[PDB]
Write a protein that binds this ligand. Structure first.
Ligand SMILES: CCCCCCCCCCCCCCCCCC(=O)OC[C@H](COP(=O)([O-])OCC(O)COP(=O)([O-])OC[C@@H](COC(=O)CCCCCCCCCCCCCCCCC)OC(=O)CCCCCCCCCCCCCCCCC)OC(=O)CCCCCCCCCCCCCCCCC
Ligand SMILES: CCCCCCCCCCCCCCCCCC(=O)OC[C@H](COP(=O)([O-])OCC[N+](C)(C)C)OC(=O)CCCCCCCCCCCCCCCCC
Ligand SMILES: CCCCCCCCCCCCCCCCCC(=O)OC[C@H](COP(=O)([O-])OCC[N+](C)(C)C)OC(=O)CCCCCCCCCCCCCCCCC
Ligand SMILES: CCCCCCCCCCCCCCCCCC(=O)OC[C@H](COP(=O)([O-])OCC[N+](C)(C)C)OC(=O)CCCCCCCCCCCCCCCCC
Ligand SMILES: CCCCCCCCCCCCCCCCCC(=O)OC[C@H](COP(=O)([O-])OCC[N+](C)(C)C)OC(=O)CCCCCCCCCCCCCCCCC
Ligand SMILES: CCCCCCCCCCCCCCCCCC(=O)OC[C@H](COP(=O)(O)OCCN)OC(=O)CCCCCCCCCCCCCCCCC
Ligand SMILES: CCCCCCCCCCCCCCCCCC(=O)OC[C@H](COP(=O)(O)OCCN)OC(=O)CCCCCCCCCCCCCCCCC
Ligand SMILES: CCCCCCCCCCCCCCCCCC(=O)OC[C@H](COP(=O)(O)OCCN)OC(=O)CCCCCCCCCCCCCCCCC
Ligand SMILES: CCCCCCCCCCCCCCCCCC(=O)OC[C@H](COP(=O)(O)OCCN)OC(=O)CCCCCCCCCCCCCCCCC
Lengths: 347, 105, 98, 175, 70, 114, 110, 311, 96, 80
């Protein structure tokens, strides 16, 4: 791809998300999602193999169906309110359809069935864009319509997201599918606290984006797409062996790392509202995520080490990859729990 | 995150299409201009939580202007009672409802 | 609720369930998706004309433009799939099972 | 009957969506969606949104379903059908369309007037010509205010169309 | 020579003259000996319906003047 | 809720301007000049009361002044006005520009006699 | 109503002429013909370029759909804004055509 | 009484299409230093009747149609769209006087490509389908410049109303302020109707019988006469006396006959384009000029203070 | 030529619009009496129909306000024949 | 700038005509003395009813009749 065309298309992705964030009119919300989808499709087809075309097709179909359901929600709101302000909705039918459409856009379960496939088919940088930047616009719309969101619906989608994103990561050796099921679990955590305190939603979204970008930046820096290929990193770049894995200890949510901060603040703000069963069971399923991701940590900085001979040739070459913000993102994703009351800046 | 860039920069990007009672081309009102204006001037600035229960009457008037459910229900009641009184026979239509009286203007 | 709007929503849901039940082709999926867009056009148009709300007259044109650009994108994706495999079958699009 | 023409065209619209949504083939699905677009355009035109209905014919059916049929003809390889002499090749067509229009008549049965006559739509349905507008169409002036009022909408729409051109030329090159 | 194309052009020109003469004469026969009232806008339609109401014969074209008011 | 209050059919009786639209459009500019004050009182009353029930007597004054306008045409300039609205009435779009000589004769007789 | 009556008349005349042009030569008992193309029997080759000209049509047709309310847009009170957005829409259509040029998109069907 | 008006529109359309075949064969005859038909009737007046009776009793080609429904609906749609393009034409008064008659004709002409596409798919041949796809791509390419030229001229009309376009040209023919739009419009109408030098289909619907081929042929000639009448009304607007409408009718009929004969005289003068040469002619020649003149006719009535009225 | 003639057409448009403006108060008074006549006729027929039904109030406003609400098509032409309903609600839309 | 212009008017006169006409269409209405009159004619075209004002007692510019001398003038439009 021509780098000018790449810059213009990435600015169009960013512009679509900014248009969703700043606009007060529902048609401009729908326009921002259309522009965001249209612009992100060539980022996925950047390498032109059949897997990226299949992934772009499945992503197009799911996001297109979600855009149509979003416009049907907007149209029902115009029926029952005669106006277009992006605020609460004035029909439970419009609220239900817009919550379903945004859950399809996030890949929350049971609309999760595209995220591991699409994340598998596309490269690591476009997978990073899809799992970090594309979450921002539907979480903004869910932030603005929360006087209308049905409680039982959003809690059902959140627990089904956390359970399916947990039980998806057992059978996986592909790193992109692991990050996709981690995405499904974390979006369930974010929408669990949405109707109680959406500042903790924004805290979980920011910490998740930092940890996800650290993991995808390390996967790009090591040229590893599978567990089996990630396990050759100790003989090639030994500082990458610890950074990937203590960032991955952050991502499951485990103290004293900063990925324990969002889940702890979510449990904290849901027990103010006299919900005790629900954060307990959601964090038990997060321990199931810890179970599988700790097995991956064992496989990379423990048992299955063995190397090949052509590592002897890779030893004579240093990295030229621009590991952009990787020490910054790695320090932010691990040592930020002593600065936990910084979360008031998101209020 | 609602980053209110339009109110920060003092530009209008999409507030003009937002409501029916806004400034329209050639000063055309909507069908429910007054009802939406009354609902907006009731619910302004008090917050949505107070607005759902303190401005419920203006909103019911405005929704019933928009959809006309009570009016269609009342017209169906009158017209079905009229059909019953025609078929039973205790009513006959006047000349101004059969088209026989050469209208006012 | 209102009478003709129930029909237009029912058309939307029939084309939704057509998109939500794949038979053979990707083109049939794009057809059901654009039938959904057509019913959205009709329903938005009938509301905006019924309400005499002037500045939303330009809204369904913008709906049509953005979603027909979306449909051009879908046709190009279908063409790249059909040049990969020979047919546009949805069962040829299953390499992301593993 | 003639009062209820918008409701009748909506019933034809729902039946056409049932027609192509059951998906016999993408080519017959495209044909059913063309017929459904025409009758839904008739629904729009029988409120008085004449520019929007002509936008349906000129843009939806005129460009987009043309490109859908054009793309569909370049896939799904054709095969012949029954072609016996003119009773079979055209008389079966006439009887099939006669059964289809008799189905359009037959779905308007006594189970339907229980929904119709209880919630009588006509009498007060199309209230578009309630009073006077003036020397303009309100619909036309609201569409025309895309340029004076809808500046941001024009910017984002034209930028998305330029980006659409760029995006199609990227993903179709295959390199 | 070249003027033998003129009978066919004459027949084709008469056939293109028929629709316009037809619609002009039918508009004058169906609208009181005058042009057909054009109502592109709702004000023209409101005045046309007001004419149909004030004519007394349920025909918009039958005009009423100063002989009608006292 | 409450009973909507409607005026009686005797509150709605007034003598009607029973002329056609071309007849109104032919005398339109002179009607706006001569019948200005009750028309403007009525339209101020109509955009201020926002209710056709509070404007009935001003509407009757409008109808009365219109009838006096057309009686004053009928007493003085009946044939030039009839010649002018017949020519206005022939047109489909009811053009003013097709009827300049009948307009000139109507304006001449109206400026002379009135 | 007059429109729909004229459409029904045109459709009925078209279907009548099609019915006559199919049924009138079938009254002939001519013969039952036995064994009734450049390529032999191979598949239809897909051409990428025909699809590209169809999509370029669709995108410029959507831009034309944006251009259509301009004779009504000339009547506005905000004329500087209207003129700027009209020239901007036709300029973005021209930028789309220039980008379609300079990436060899209009080639072998130029 | 309205049905009399509809039939006196649509039956003289068929008669004028019938004798346009005679006029075309005679004018192509005399321009090629020979004669056209002069034996069958007196100077060929019975040639269209003999040709029509020959085409409607000729043996059907007996196709194995890929679809029954599209094989039947392509001539029906071709004839219906050929006949419905005439009803808004102000000659001087339209049969159906509508506010958006220009936009109506543009939409019904955009619908005309489905007859080509369905006729090409309803044959078993792949070469017929390839020819139909090339014809559809040609027609959709030239509809772009149709729409943009037409919008640019309607910026001087003031509205989409066809009857207003006579009022627009009461002082000057509109070809005087818009002759480049007129000439690109004329070649674009020449390329809409698959007319030489743009008839590559004769260099798609050859599966039909002689009867249905006559139906496609007469739909094509109704489109040709119609587009010449529309171009006459659009650029060469005749004088309209509202009391004697037959003056306008004689005047636009003479001008439309001259423009149809100009189609006949261009097909007898030029070699055909190669397919990419007319794709080039559209996309790289007419379309940049069309966008530039569209900007010019947007901005010119604002700089001359000559914005036309909406009504 | 188009400059001169489109300026003349704008002046003729303003002349036609001033003719409309001079006619509007008469037409507005007649329209007011028209809709009040039709609502009073429908109110009297509601009073002579809705008698057997208990708990009914003739002329009950479905709104909680006493502000004049512009009457719908079926409040005016509701109890009338279907030909008047056709000419009222599809008259201008279907006119030629 | 004059050799390139003659070279492109030799090679590609269609695109030279296109860029020249589009450039005139862009930069010409900013230079025209009649662009203000388009604005003045469009804002003098009375689509709506001129709703009168309640005479409080001090409005010496608002007329009481159309034929009163005060008020906006369209004598520039009849003269031009
Ligand atoms: C406000 C929000 C700001 C967010 C961060 C913005 C910058 C980072 C993102 C963009 C990016 O990648 O920029 C390149 C990026 C380098 O990315 P890299 O690949 O990680 O760097 C590797 C080596 O350092 C490359 O080294 P080198 O050999 O190429 O040359 C030395 C290089 C060259 O230096 C320059 O080029 C600088 C001089 C030019 C500046 C621009 C002039 C115009 O200097 C550095 O890179 C030194 C480190 C710079 C700081 C990086 C982190 C910044 C702070 C991030 C926020 C942390 C928040 C923690 C909160 C905790 C509590 C919640 O940054 C710079 O080059 C300059 C950063 C300036 C930071 C200013 C902070 C205050 C802003 C107000
Ligand atoms: C045993 C370990 C699991 C249970 C953890 C309960 C933590 C807690 O605070 O319980 C008190 C809470 C008390 O909740 P509560 O205090 O909000 O009770 C309702 C409010 N009052 C006091 C007025 C009645 O106990 C529970 O919620 C009981 C259910 C525990 C969660 C389900 C456990 C499933 C198996 C794992
Ligand atoms: C719009 C254009 C003008 C209108 C269309 C044409 C106008 C004239 C319509 C009538 C023409 C005559 C009937 C069709 C032609 C029949 C020619 C033919 O082959 O006939 C032999 C055929 C067959 O005769 P046969 O039995 O000798 O068959 C010869 C073939 N073998 C021996 C191999 C089986 O005759 C018929 O089919 C008779 C059909 C009815 C005849 C006409 C009845 C009146 C119709 C009015
Ligand atoms: C690239 C964009 C260049 C043109 C920008 C808009 C030009 C213009 O006249 O805007 C005035 C118009 C309208 O201003 P206006 O002066 O017509 O406002 C008068 C008020 N009304 C509309 C009610 C009559 O738009 C704006 O001011 C806001 C929208 C555009 C804001 C800038 C967006 C830039 C995006 C860049 C990417
Ligand atoms: C509607 C009534 C009739 C109208 C007239 C039409 C009837 C006459 C028809 C004649 C026979 C045509 C038969 C078909 C021919 C098809 C081929 C053909 O003509 O191709 C078109 C040719 C194509 O060009 P070409 O192919 O010859 O050139 C080669 C092109 N390159 C280099 C790209 C390979 O020309 C055009 O496209 C021009 C169209 C008309 C443009 C008019 C411009 C007007 C002047 C503007 C201003 C100029 C000065 C600059 C600005 C100054 C500012 C101060
Ligand atoms: C309430 C919150 C509101 C919003 C606040 C801000 C949110 C920020 C969200 C960040 C989302 C990041 C999305 C991905 C980066 C976007 C730019 C991009 O495309 O980078 C990838 C790029 C591709 O280059 P390419 O040529 O494809 O290389 C492949 C090899 N040939 O280049 C590469 O591949 C180079 C390798 C390194 C890439 C590192 C990218 C890191 C980006 C994230 C930084 C951390 C997030 C910011 C801080 C927290 C914000 C919440
Ligand atoms: C808007 C205008 C539309 C106009 C459409 C029509 C255009 C054509 C106009 C007329 C052209 C010429 C007509 C005459 C043709 C020649 C007829 C002829 O000479 O036939 C002779 C033939 C044999 O006769 P025979 O008895 O053998 O003679 C031997 C003599 N010792 O005997 C026969 O063949 C038998 C008799 C046949 C007569 C045929 C007459 C012509 C039929 C035309 C049909 C359409 C008429 C117009 C309809 C619309 C207007 C009303
Ligand atoms: C396989 C099926 C058969 C295929 C062959 C036959 C169908 C295809 C060919 C014919 C297509 C017909 C298209 C008709 C609609 C065109 C748009 C239209 O209605 O424009 C006319 C007019 C708009 O002008 P305007 O002046 O604004 O309105 C009058 C108010 N003064 O608006 C009016 O005057 C409105 C009049 C009432 C509304 C009439 C709408 C049309 C009738 C319903 C749809 C019929 C066609 C369905 C199939 C379409 C093709 C798939
Ligand atoms: C500012 C106003 C708005 C301007 C933008 C809108 C213009 C309206 C028309 C839109 C045209 C869209 C397509 C333009 C594409 C330009 C690039 C191009 O075509 O380059 C190739 C061409 C050489 O042609 P070639 O590749 O060989 O093609 C085969 C046939 N020979 O190379 C060329 O032909 C060179 C083309 C560029 C140089 C043309 C210079 C004309 C200058 C006229 C005087 C100045 C006018 C004022 C505007 C500023 C222009 C710089």
């Amino acid at each position: 791809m021509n780098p000018i065309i790449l810059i213009i298309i990435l600015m169009t992705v960013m512009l679509g998300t900014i248009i969703v964030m700043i606009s007060t009119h529902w048609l401009l919300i729908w326009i921002g999602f259309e522009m965001n989808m249209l612009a992100i499709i060539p980022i996925m087809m950047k390498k032109h193999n059949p897997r990226a075309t299949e992934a772009s097709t499945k992503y197009f179909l799911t996001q297109s169906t979600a855009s149509m359901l979003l416009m049907m929600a907007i149209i029902i709101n115009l029926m029952f309110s005669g106006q277009w302000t992006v605020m609460k909705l004035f029909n439970p039918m419009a609220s239900m359809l817009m919550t379903m459409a945004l859950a399809m856009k996030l890949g929350m379960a049971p609309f999760h069935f595209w995220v591991p496939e699409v994340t598998q088919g596309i490269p690591l940088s476009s997978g990073l864009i899809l799992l970090t930047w594309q979450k921002l616009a539907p979480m903004s719309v869910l932030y603005q319509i929360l006087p209308s969101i049905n409680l039982d619906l959003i809690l059902t989608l959140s627990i089904l997201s956390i359970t399916i994103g947990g039980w998806g990561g057992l059978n996986q050796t592909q790193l992109r599918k692991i990050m996709a099921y981690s995405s499904i679990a974390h979006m369930g955590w974010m929408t669990a606290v949405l109707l109680y305190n959406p500042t903790m939603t924004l805290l979980n979204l920011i910490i998740y984006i930092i940890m996800t970008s650290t993991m995808f930046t390390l996967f790009m820096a090591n040229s590893t797409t599978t567990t089996l290929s990630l396990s050759h990193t100790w003989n090639k770049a030994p500082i990458m062996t610890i950074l990937v894995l203590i960032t991955l200890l952050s991502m499951g949510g485990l103290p004293p790392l900063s990925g324990f901060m969002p889940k702890w603040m979510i449990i904290q703000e849901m027990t103010k509202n006299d919900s005790i069963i629900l954060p307990t069971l959601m964090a038990i399923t997060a321990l199931l995520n810890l179970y599988f991701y700790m097995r991956l940590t064992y496989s990379t900085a423990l048992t299955m080490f063995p190397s090949t001979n052509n590592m002897k040739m890779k030893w004579q070459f240093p990295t030229t990859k621009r590991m952009t913000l990787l020490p910054t993102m790695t320090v932010l994703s691990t040592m930020l729990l002593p600065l936990t009351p910084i979360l008031s800046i998101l209020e | 995150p609602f980053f209110d860039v339009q109110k920060k920069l003092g530009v209008d990007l999409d507030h003009w299409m937002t409501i029916q009672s806004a400034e329209q081309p050639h000063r055309i009102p909507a069908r429910c201009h007054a009802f939406e204006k009354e609902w907006i001037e009731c619910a302004h600035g008090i917050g949505s939580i107070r607005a759902e229960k303190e401005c419920k009457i203006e909103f019911e008037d405005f929704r019933e202007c928009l959809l006309r459910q009570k009016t269609m229900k009342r017209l169906n009641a009158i017209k079905r009672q009229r059909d019953k009184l025609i078929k039973e026979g205790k009513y006959t239509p006047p000349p101004h409802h059969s088209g026989q009286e050469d209208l006012r203007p | 609720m209102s009478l003709v709007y129930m029909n237009i929503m029912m058309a939307f849901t029939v084309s939704l369930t057509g998109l939500l039940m794949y038979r053979s082709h990707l083109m049939s999926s794009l057809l059901c998706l654009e039938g959904m867009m057509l019913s959205l056009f009709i329903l938005a148009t009938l509301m905006i004309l019924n309400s005499h709300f002037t500045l939303a007259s330009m809204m369904p044109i913008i709906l049509l433009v953005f979603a027909a650009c979306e449909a051009a994108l879908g046709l190009s994706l279908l063409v790249m799939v059909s040049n990969t495999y020979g047919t546009d079958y949805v069962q040829n699009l299953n390499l992301l099972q593993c | 009957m003639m009062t209820y023409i918008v409701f009748i065209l909506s019933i034809i619209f729902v039946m056409g969506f049932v027609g192509f949504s059951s998906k016999p083939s993408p080519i017959y699905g495209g044909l059913g969606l063309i017929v459904s677009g025409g009758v839904g355009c008739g629904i729009v035109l029988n409120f008085g949104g004449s520019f929007l209905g002509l936008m349906v014919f000129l843009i939806y059916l005129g460009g987009m379903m043309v490109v859908f049929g054009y793309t569909t003809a370049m896939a799904t390889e054709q095969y012949p059908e029954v072609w016996v002499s003119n009773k079979v090749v055209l008389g079966t067509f006439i009887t099939g369309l006669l059964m289809e229009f008799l189905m359009v008549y037959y779905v308007l049965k006594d189970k339907e007037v229980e929904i119709v006559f209880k919630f009588n739509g006509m009498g007060d349905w199309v209230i578009y010509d309630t009073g006077d507008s003036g020397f303009f169409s309100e619909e036309a002036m609201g569409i025309a205010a895309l340029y004076s009022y809808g500046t941001w909408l024009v910017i984002v729409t034209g930028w998305s169309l330029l980006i659409g051109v760029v995006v199609i030329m990227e993903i179709t090159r295959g390199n | 020579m070249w003027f033998e194309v003129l009978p066919g052009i004459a027949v084709m020109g008469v056939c293109l003259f028929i629709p316009g003469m037809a619609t002009a004469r039918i508009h004058r026969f169906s609208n009181g000996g005058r042009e057909k009232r054009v109502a592109h806008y709702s004000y023209q339609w409101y005045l046309m319906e007001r004419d149909r109401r004030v004519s007394g014969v349920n025909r918009y074209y039958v005009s009423k003047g100063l002989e009608n008011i006292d | 809720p409450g009973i909507v209050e409607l005026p009686s059919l005797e509150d709605l009786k007034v003598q009607e301007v029973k002329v056609s639209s071309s007849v109104l459009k032919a005398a339109a500019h002179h009607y706006g000049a001569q019948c200005d004050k009750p028309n403007k009182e009525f339209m101020l009353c109509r955009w201020e009361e926002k209710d056709p029930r509070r404007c009935l007597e001003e509407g009757k004054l409008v109808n009365q002044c219109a009838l006096e306008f057309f009686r004053q045409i009928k007493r003085h300039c009946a044939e030039p006005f009839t010649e002018y609205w017949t020519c206005i009435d022939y047109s489909g779009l009811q053009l003013f520009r097709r009827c300049r000589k009948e307009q000139a004769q109507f304006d001449k007789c109206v400026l002379d006699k009135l | 109503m007059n429109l729909m009556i004229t459409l029904l008349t045109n459709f009925t005349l078209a279907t009548l002429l099609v019915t006559i042009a199919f049924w009138l030569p079938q009254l002939n008992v001519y013969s039952e013909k036995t064994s009734p193309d450049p390529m032999g029997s191979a598949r239809l080759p897909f051409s990428m370029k025909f699809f590209l000209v169809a999509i370029t049509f669709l995108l410029f047709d959507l831009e034309i759909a944006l251009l259509l309310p301009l004779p009504w847009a000339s009547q506005t009170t905000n004329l500087n804004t209207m003129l700027t957005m009209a020239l901007l829409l036709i300029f973005l259509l021209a930028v789309s055509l220039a980008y379609e040029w300079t990436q060899k998109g209009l080639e072998w069907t130029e | 009484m309205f049905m009399i008006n509809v039939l006196t529109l649509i039956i003289p359309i068929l008669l004028a299409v019938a004798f346009l075949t005679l006029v075309e064969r005679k004018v192509l005859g005399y321009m090629q230093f020979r004669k056209g038909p002069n034996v069958v009737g007196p100077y060929g007046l019975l040639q269209p009747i003999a040709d029509a009776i020959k085409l409607f009793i000729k043996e059907p080609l007996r196709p194995a149609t890929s679809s029954i429904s599209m094989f039947i609906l392509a001539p029906i749609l071709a004839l219906t769209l050929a006949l419905t393009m005439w009803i808004p034409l102000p000659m001087p008064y339209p049969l159906i006087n509508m506010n958006l008659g220009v936009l109506f004709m543009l939409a019904m002409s955009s619908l005309a490509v489905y007859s080509i596409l369905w006729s090409g798919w309803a044959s078993n041949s792949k070469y017929a389908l390839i020819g139909a796809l090339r014809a559809v791509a040609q027609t959709i390419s030239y509809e772009v410049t149709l729409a943009i030229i037409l919008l640019s001229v309607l910026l001087m009309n003031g509205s989409f109303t066809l009857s207003t376009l006579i009022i627009t040209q009461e002082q000057v023919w509109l070809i005087f302020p818009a002759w480049p739009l007129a000439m690109m419009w004329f070649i674009s109408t020449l390329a809409e109707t698959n007319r030489a030098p743009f008839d590559l289909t004769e260099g798609f619907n050859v599966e039909y019988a002689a009867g249905p081929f006559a139906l496609f042929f007469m739909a094509e000639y109704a489109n040709i006469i119609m587009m010449n009448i529309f171009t006459t009304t659009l650029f060469l607007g005749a004088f309209h006396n509202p009391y004697m409408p037959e003056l306008y009718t004689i005047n636009f009929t003479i001008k439309s006959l001259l423009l149809s004969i100009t189609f006949l005289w261009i097909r007898a003068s030029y070699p055909r384009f190669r397919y990419d040469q007319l794709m080039h002619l559209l996309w790289k020649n007419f379309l940049p000029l069309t966008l530039a003149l569209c900007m010019w006719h947007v901005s010119l009535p604002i700089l001359l203070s000559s914005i036309p009225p909406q009504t | 030529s188009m400059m001169r003639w489109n300026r003349e057409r704008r002046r003729l448009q303003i002349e036609d619009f001033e003719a409309r403006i001079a006619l509007m108060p008469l037409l507005q008074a007649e329209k007011d009496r028209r809709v009040l006549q039709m609502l009073r006729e429908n109110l009297e027929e509601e009073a002579t129909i809705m008698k057997d039904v208990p708990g009914w109030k003739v002329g009950e406003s479905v709104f909680h306000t006493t502000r004049w609400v512009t009457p719908m098509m079926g409040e005016l032409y509701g109890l009338r024949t279907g030909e008047e309903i056709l000419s009222s609600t599809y008259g201008f839309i279907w006119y030629t | 700038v004059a050799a390139f212009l003659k070279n492109v008017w030799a090679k590609e006169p269609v695109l030279v005509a296109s860029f020249a006409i589009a450039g005139l269409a862009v930069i010409l209405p900013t230079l025209s003395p009649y662009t203000k009159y388009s604005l003045m004619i469009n804002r003098a075209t009375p689509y709506n009813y001129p709703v009168p004002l309640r005479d409080d007692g001090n409005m010496p510019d608002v007329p009481s009749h159309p034929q009163d001398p005060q008020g906006p003038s369209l004598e520039w439009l009849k003269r031009l």
